């Protein structure tokens, strides 16, 4: 709406594009930079005692 040039300038982030640097608010550290609990807090609490939360990836 402001301008195609304005949008292009806003989106461009690097002068040299040969390097890929994804934007992250923070970098994972625990569990070898992984997430153990990919769930909500409620799911994390309940799934340890209630059936149906685990989807049996087989």
């Amino acid at each position: 709406v402001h301008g195609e040039e304005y949008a292009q300038k806003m989106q461009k982030r690097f002068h040299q594009t040969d390097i890929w640097a994804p934007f992250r608010h923070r970098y994972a550290y625990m569990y070898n930079s992984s997430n153990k609990n990919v769930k909500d807090y409620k799911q994390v609490t309940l799934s340890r005692y209630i059936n149906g939360f685990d989807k049996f990836n087989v």
Partner: protein
């Protein structure tokens, strides 16, 4: 023919009922823990940290896809709740 127990064994056997009761209670406790952790997963799932990096990624790929990717790709401006009670970021900042 007095086929009685040896004296040392007979003396030792006095405390055996306490051992039996301890085993009963301990088996009960262990079985309760096993069943509580077994029912939700239908198995005794190995701990997440007891796994290779690739194994961890493969295990959690499906959960990531079902919980984050699909809402992210089906997102609409009017899907978000106005109360700001949205799901927390996967890596909280």
């Amino acid at each position: 023919v007095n086929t009685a127990y040896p004296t040392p064994l007979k003396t030792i056997l006095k405390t055996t009922p306490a051992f039996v009761v301890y085993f009963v209670f301990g088996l009960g406790f262990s079985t309760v823990i096993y069943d509580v952790v077994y029912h939700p997963k239908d198995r005794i799932e190995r701990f997440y940290f007891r796994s290779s990096k690739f194994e961890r990624l493969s295990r959690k790929r499906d959960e990531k896809l079902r919980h984050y990717f699909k809402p992210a790709i089906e997102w609409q401006p009017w899907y978000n709740t106005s109360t700001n009670n949205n799901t927390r970021p996967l890596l909280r900042y």
